[PDB]
Write a protein that binds this ligand. Structure first.
Ligand code: SF4
Ligand code: SF4
Ligand code: SF4
Ligand code: SF4
Ligand code: SF4
Lengths: 290, 629, 52, 628, 291
């Protein structure tokens, strides 16, 4: 299975999970039941950026699966791969929205789940200033808790805002990593879809700071690529869904670095086994100056 | 009826040639009318004076055998083998001259060593010691080894390290492993003699064996020694098409293939006495322009403007502005001698290998190359006084081009997209990565001449545009490269105008045009080198890669030899002009079907460029699925 | 149509002939008058203009 | 017209008609009127812009090819490529011989049989011989010979018999030879589209290439063959198809490479193979040779000659050929088809000469004797498949004498040397008879057959006319075999056909009027002989009353031979017109201007009697120039 | 001037001299005057051998010039050269016959001139039994008298019959060579035409001992070539007439040896400058063995 097929398989799996959770939400709560994220002004940010539509009820959430379906075209060309990554991102957002409408408190500390607009505005000032020279999106599991803690604290000591997805949260807790918004170590959630909660940070950064109106998807992607200094460090074995989510990160212009053997794409998808050089490799790949 | 060219400057000059009452290659093609069916199918034989013999191109009808009893397949296979042998001879003679020039290099001479690192790497490839040695002693030893490759009768020849071990083992098992170049040419000529070889498969295998000595020994050594003596090409800007001629300057057009003469002419053009003479004859200066492969060489290494490719040579004289036309060998239409009578142009032959009747012969002296080049250039400059400015018409049509993409230059460009914390540097690894990931679907080489049978430059341009639109990166050589230069494909902007998404992204990241001009016809060896490195980086044979070669408008025997050795190396080749083999069904079956069993590649005959692009994409995709990428 | 001694026996007319009237003979190709449709394509396809 | 003058050939042609098989004559008839453009040489196919045909008549029709090449350019390039192909064939033969010499050993299958000849050749190649092992000398000589083929630096090595004046003339003209394969490659390069478009330079390049055949390739092949297999001496043999035996296994050796035929001859005396031939019901093994390999084995061992080129098919038509073993060159591919109509095993042995539907048994040069033995065993076992009801062997055979190498000729000439005067072991008696005018001159008759000429007619008529005019004749190849079949290779022929001076010379020296000097590469011997005569008289070879004739040639090798013979300074008559009549400049160069360059020129004459008259007149003109 | 042209020129000069001396005989003696050689039954032996005709009067001697004319065909082939040599031999015979017509005794001693038939029968028996190993025909002049005397006495000591023409007669006298029929040293005459007097010895040997009738020229030439062991040693510069007469000797199968540079013909015309080896060269060339 080559890179394109891996991304397409991951996107299809994300679509299947989104369809299942949306069916569960429709069964339990009804199509008139409200759909929203806590304290946001852009409804579902990824769908709003891609199409301009605001998802307000469960029926509209079920109708948002058509966006995911139309973004998956299984032809081995780079544009289709980027669209399939974006389809995975939309499916992850739909899954997170369904989680929020199904449970009153989907995320229990230390996981924070969705990040509200006021937090985005608070982080915007140090973002453009340079006190936050980048965003380190760490996903998966490192071979040890010690190495995960070392990498996370190296990023933290450099001022980067690091977000944690998956078992790396538990490894960092075992590694005595101090977490919080002021400490710039944000645990999003143990599920892969929780990575969307940092993606919407970039998307809304284009909506708030960039002033790009909803539906101008290419302008949003250009803004995230040229203004948001985000990158992904994917540790541990990578499923097809993880590779598809990384394709979404690449579609937003965010390079993906991993310790796994993957079909490398220069400046976009890079393998770095040496955990002692992963921080420097990511800073070079994202062109970040400390 | 049919348009003669897609190039507007070519069309304006064809109208001028009609107004001036001079004949062109198009006019002679029209005069030839319906060409002989027997010769077109390859079923005519003249190998002995019992003939001429012609057998039916349609099996089961008419005369079946020649007088000696040779079948249509035998006649076709022998004719094809002799075309391959002639192309191999042309390329090998070019490389032999380059090696002899290398053998005569000196510190204080006209010919020096300009790339010492390249010479040391080549010496490593030839098992020549370099440490603590004088550079010219090394150069002479390397030249001796290269010369031995041409005529050794005992032992094995030396092949470049980029050639995969698996490909060499496959050649040895098949029986096509190359011997000395001249020996293989002689073997082909011997086996086509009356009453020798009358088996199509063995004849084709002998021709493949002969073509390998061209691709991997003759052209390769010529290219690498030319780099050693005249400098490795790097990315450089130039201008292309007939508009580069200057009305108010002396116009000196270099046509042919051998680079030493054109290098010495370029050096002589900066001589203060000759510049002063050009000023004194009433010209603003000296304007050197190149055509065909010698133009490609001087343009790759110095940015000399390219006046035009093969079927434009006559039109260069039709402008009335060419004060001197200096030619060495190969692809020099003899009609130029007649044509220059209608203008003031001095048509100067310089090589004892290529005498042309009614041309001015000034033998280029290899012993004193610079002085000889200065004398020839002085004749061209003095001819400016005979210019008739009332007969001058230079089209205002020229195009910016970027070229100079040797393998070394490509690797240097690829180093840009290498993460320093990962590495390694100075490899083809980024290209291998983009090919394996599928961001680039493949790489295709577009090579070959023009041919009056095809609308000039149409097939080249359509094939190149289709390939780059399908995210296939294109490397170009020769007259195809010059057609791309004239059209405007050799530009960074072309990436966003013609390329597909993946190739556009790659071009933006690496800062290269989507079409890479890798030099002259012998520089096709560079392409081989590149592919080999990629194969060696992936641990596979060259037949496992999604690569292809295309000759949309080929005419020469050299093109036949090139296609043969490209297929024998394991790279599928598309031919835009049918070779004279349709009369022999067995030969067609060998070249287009059975060759894949032998060397993992085969010929594709397709005269429709759009269909050729579709077939190339499908073949690349199926090879990718075989490879798992 | 009738062929003449100018013929150098290049074989072009033979094949081009729609009616296939033209056949190779002792000293030159020949035209069978009974099966010649008078098209004149043979005259067109001749390097020496033998078919008259 | 008649197909041949040979009665056995005619009987077998009647048999082939009765058997329903087609011959070369039938295929020639089927080809009918051959293409005029190709016959005149004005057709070009050197690039895929073509095919281009221009008018053979200047001032009419299409004048230039698509690239602009004139009729003279197209003709000259075609001629040069014919020369290059002939040179390639001969040079590949010589290269195989040189490699065989390099692999000689005391206890191996291939040894040194003529040490004196090897030492003389080593002297010619600047190889030391005193106090050295003979096989070390042989290996050094083979290395020097091989370097002649592919050296890129320095000058090639030429035989001492070549006059210094001829070398200097070649250097001034610009045709002094380089390494053989290099010259072949140069000719092929300059004929490529858009290279050489000047007929004079093209012809000079072809002459330069042909010199590497005449004086290097063929010469080295001949001398190394003498070293390895023995210098030929006077020997008796029988000729024509009657030599086949009904009650014996018949093994026919066809081709040019002598190592295979030498090993087959040696294997034929193997006790096991002779016993096997007896066990399949045959009286024994009857080896017969055809064309140049037959000439080689006949010159060195007296092997009977079955026939020349255009008889090869008829040899199978007899129904008595159990095995036909072929190496390379002048092997009609139709033999394979023909072999299906009989029991004959048609065996190809060389990787250079695969033939479809033939039995391929690759001759292994690493173990030549064992490989020859297994091939011969296949031929012997095929005797059980003989159908004796289909067998017809004409009772027509002729006695012949051959083996006249230069050494043998010198040995014969030693008889007419007064001991008190001397010197011995020189060509001086021959030079004396030529200078005195007792012999008017010497003529070489060489070449193939050709269906365009009544087979063997031109050879026989030319030879008889020349010897009647007191011109001594040396013959090679298929012409020599035609002379053998006719009966000219006999001492008695001197009193039956020769004129008074030649009859007296033959009686004094005890030789036939016609001297068989071997195969087509052995034409180098003729050069050697002429050179010696020239060197004895202190003149160039163009000053001598000598000539060469190719009455019925067909092959590219024949073109290269005529070219290098003319370039060496010997006028050459061609009995078959080469495809050059379309280029007036090329005709003028070959037949008129060449004399200004090298002192000799081509003569095209299809009438043998007129050719004999012209040869005599030209020889008398050169005698009057020389003062003799 | 090549060998053929030298021989043709010599034969023409011999014909010119024969015509002049015959004209003198006609003007002084008339065509009815008798023509004969002293004591012979073969008339003029060369003409009788070639044609079978006996010449008795001067008018027939004048008619014998047509034989010389018919024997000179100037075509460069070996048969014509041999016929032209025979033309010189016939012309020389006509000149010698006219000498006897004009002057009663044309030869003064030591020269003997014509050799009569009884002498031939006298020395014929030693020629058959091998007591005379061969006939050494020495004509011309040696570089010195002692060289000629050495060669002549070398032949004499070996039992060969030596005949002398030209200045070697005087050189041998200066060298004190004892000349006589019993001494086998016969001086014929100082003129080149006197060599015909030893030629007629070989011709009449075929007529007398071979029993060959006149007119059977080929049989007579075959006889002299196989049966008469004669050879020619030509010393000193050789004129065209001498060369044409040598061609006559070659026509009879007698090899010609000389010290001059000539267009050598193997076994027939040979150059030997070394006077110390001329005798041995001639014996080998004529296959003469001394017991
Ligand atoms: S090689 Fe055979 S087919 Fe070709 S021209 Fe000669 S006879 Fe005809
Ligand atoms: S096309 Fe003309 S030349 Fe050719 S065969 Fe026909 S009539 Fe003859
Ligand atoms: S006129 Fe037409 S039908 Fe008649 S012979 Fe010519 S081509 Fe054939
Ligand atoms: S290809 Fe053959 S048949 Fe056709 S024109 Fe040329 S020589 Fe004649
Ligand atoms: S080289 Fe010239 S004449 Fe020959 S086929 Fe090509 S274009 Fe025609």
């Amino acid at each position: 299975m080559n890179l394109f097929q891996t991304v397409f398989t991951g996107s299809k799996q994300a679509l299947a999970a989104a369809e299942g959770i949306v069916k569960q939400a429709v069964d339990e709560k009804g199509r008139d039941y409200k759909v929203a994220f806590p304290d946001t002004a852009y409804s579902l940010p990824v769908i709003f950026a891609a199409t301009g539509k605001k998802i307000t009820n469960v029926g509209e959430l079920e109708g948002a699966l058509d966006i995911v379906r139309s973004l998956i075209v299984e032809e081995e060309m780079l544009d289709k791969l980027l669209n399939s990554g974006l389809a995975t991102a939309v499916a992850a957002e739909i899954i997170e929205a369904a989680k929020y409408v199904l449970s009153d408190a989907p995320y229990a500390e230390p996981c924070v789940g969705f990040i509200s607009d006021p937090i985005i505005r608070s982080l915007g000032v140090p973002l453009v200033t340079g006190d936050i020279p980048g965003v380190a999106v760490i996903l998966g599991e490192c071979p040890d808790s010690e190495t995960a803690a070392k990498i996370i604290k190296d990023y933290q000591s450099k001022g980067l805002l690091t977000c944690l997805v998956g078992k790396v949260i538990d490894q960092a807790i075992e590694g005595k990593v101090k977490m919080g918004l002021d400490l710039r170590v944000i645990p999003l959630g143990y599920d892969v879809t929780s990575v969307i909660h940092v993606v919407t940070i970039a998307i809304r950064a284009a909506l708030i700071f960039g002033g790009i109106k909803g539906g101008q998807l290419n302008d949003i992607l250009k803004y995230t690529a040229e203004r948001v200094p985000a990158f992904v460090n994917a540790f541990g074995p990578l499923s097809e869904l993880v590779v598809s989510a990384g394709a979404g990160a690449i579609a937003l212009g965010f390079p993906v670095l991993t310790d796994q053997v993957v079909p490398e794409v220069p400046t976009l998808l890079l393998t770095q086994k040496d955990y002692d050089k992963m921080v420097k490799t990511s800073l070079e790949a994202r062109n970040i100056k400390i | 009826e049919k348009a003669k060219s897609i190039d507007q400057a070519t069309l304006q000059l064809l109208d001028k040639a009609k107004q001036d009452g001079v004949e062109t290659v198009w006019d002679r093609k029209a005069d030839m009318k319906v060409q002989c069916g027997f010769g077109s199918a390859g079923v005519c034989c003249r190998n002995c004076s019992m003939g001429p013999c012609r057998v039916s191109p349609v099996p089961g009808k008419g005369v079946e055998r020649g007088i000696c009893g040779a079948t249509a397949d035998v006649i076709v296979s022998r004719n094809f083998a002799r075309m391959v042998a002639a192309g191999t001879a042309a390329h090998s003679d070019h490389g032999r001259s380059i090696a002899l020039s290398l053998y005569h290099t000196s510190k204080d001479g006209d010919i020096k060593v300009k790339d010492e690192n390249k010479l040391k790497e080549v010496a490593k490839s030839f098992n020549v010691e370099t440490e603590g040695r004088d550079i010219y002693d090394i150069a002479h030893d390397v030249a001796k080894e290269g010369l031995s490759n041409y005529g050794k009768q005992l032992g094995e020849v030396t092949l470049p390290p980029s050639l995969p071990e698996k490909r060499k083992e496959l050649w040895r098992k098949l029986g096509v492993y190359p011997r000395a170049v001249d020996r293989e040419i002689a073997a082909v000529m011997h086996s086509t003699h009356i009453g020798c070889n009358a088996d199509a498969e063995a004849m084709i295998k002998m021709s493949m064996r002969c073509s390998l000595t061209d691709g991997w020994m003759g052209s390769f050594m010529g290219t690498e020694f030319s780099d050693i003596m005249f400098g490795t090409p790097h990315s450089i800007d130039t201008e292309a098409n007939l508009g580069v001629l200057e009305k108010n300057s002396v116009n000196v057009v270099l046509h042919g293939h051998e680079p030493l003469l054109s290098e010495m002419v370029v050096e002589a053009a900066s001589d203060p006495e000759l510049v002063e003479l050009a000023k004194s004859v009433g010209a603003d200066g000296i304007n050197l322009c190149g055509m065909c492969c010698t133009g490609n060489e001087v343009s790759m290494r110095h940015g000399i403007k390219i006046a035009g490719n093969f079927m434009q040579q006559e039109l260069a004289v039709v402008t009335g502005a060419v004060d001197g036309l200096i030619v060495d060998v190969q692809c020099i239409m003899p009609a130029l001698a007649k044509l220059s009578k209608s203008y003031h142009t001095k048509f100067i032959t310089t090589s004892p290998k290529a005498h042309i009747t009614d041309s001015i012969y000034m033998e280029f002296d290899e012993e004193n190359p610079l002085d000889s080049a200065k004398k020839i250039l002085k004749e061209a400059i003095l001819n400016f006084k005979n210019r008739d400015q009332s007969k001058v018409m230079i089209p205002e049509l020229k195009c910016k081009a970027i070229l100079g993409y040797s393998v070394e230059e490509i690797i240097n460009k690829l180093d840009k997209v290498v993460n320093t914390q990962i590495g390694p540097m100075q490899t083809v690894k980024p290209l291998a990565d983009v090919l394996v990931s599928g961001v680039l679907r493949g790489a295709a080489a577009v090579v070959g001449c023009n041919n009056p049978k095809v609308v000039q430059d149409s097939a080249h341009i359509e094939t190149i545009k289709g390939l780059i639109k399908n995210d296939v990166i294109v490397v170009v050589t020769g007259c195809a490269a010059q057609a791309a230069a004239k059209y405007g494909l050799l530009q960074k902007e072309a990436a966003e105008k013609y390329a597909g998404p993946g190739l556009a992204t790659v071009c933006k990241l690496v800062d290269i045009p989507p079409v890479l001009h890798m030099g002259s016809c012998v520089d096709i060896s560079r392409i081989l080198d590149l592919v080999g490195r990629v194969a060696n980086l992936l641990g596979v044979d060259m037949s496992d890669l999604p690569v292809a070669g295309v000759a949309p408008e080929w005419m020469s025997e050299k093109a036949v030899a090139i296609g043969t050795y490209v297929v024998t190396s394991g790279i599928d080749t598309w031919l835009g002009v049918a070779p004279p083999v349709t009369g022999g069904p067995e030969v067609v079956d060998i070249l287009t079907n059975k060759m894949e069993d032998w060397v993992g590649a085969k010929f594709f005959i397709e005269t429709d460029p759009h269909k050729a692009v579709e077939q190339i994409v499908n073949r690349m995709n199926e090879k990718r699925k075989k490879l798992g990428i | 149509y009738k062929i003449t001694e100018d013929c150098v026996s290049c074989g072009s007319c033979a094949s081009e002939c729609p009616a296939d009237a033209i056949s190779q003979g002792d000293s030159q190709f020949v035209i069978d008058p009974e099966k010649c449709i008078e098209c004149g394509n043979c005259a067109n396809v001749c390097p020496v203009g033998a078919p008259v």
